[PDB]
Homo-oligomer: A and B are copies of this chain.
């Protein structure tokens, strides 16, 4: 059975895990899963996400509690504590253009070896990237990003674990669901099979390993 108690997080997320965590500045983020990680000081984490939200919310709470060794994100500007720890050298930060982050994660999810993007060409992002010329235009070769566990948020799941999302809470969640080895979805409601139409489901239950509340 996919649905498990939230208290089981300390058994599924290990010290030093590489995690994808959904959410856009805390919107569509698994707030209850993050609270469990803080409850049990699961530390030395590498967190892949759009951002580190704010000091008081979402992924920001993990940084507040110094549980991350590394973040791979497109933005940190709204979290002064992420900047503090970056400057001190305690937290490694890999900044990634948001559209490249989406496609690098997706590439792992759909089994690609990489994608070429014009974004970042001729900027500091080009550093340590292979450049490939196609039709005289230059592209950066950007590589798939993998993770041990995806921690995602969704609006509802049906009995079979099919997920739907709600408005701008979707953002990175369905992409991370395809990219990680183990997928744990925090959802707001469990609904009967047949409540979520085949035309509307966005993540099929087959790829969701665990569901909390």
Contacts and interface: CB of A to CB of B under 8 A. Distances in A.
A115 B115 contact: yes
**Prevailing SS type, chain A contact patch:** mixed
Residue of A111, A116, A134, A200 contacting most chain B CB atoms (<10 Å) = A116
Contacts of A107: 115
A39 interface: no
Contacts of A144: 134
A116 B118 contact: no
B111 A112 contact: no
A143 B137 CA distance: 13
Contacts of A113: 116-118, 132, 134, 137, 139
Nearest to A133: B113
A82 to B, nearest CB: 29
8 contacts: A103-B110, A112-B116, A112-B117, A113-B117, A113-B134, A114-B115, A114-B116, A134-B144
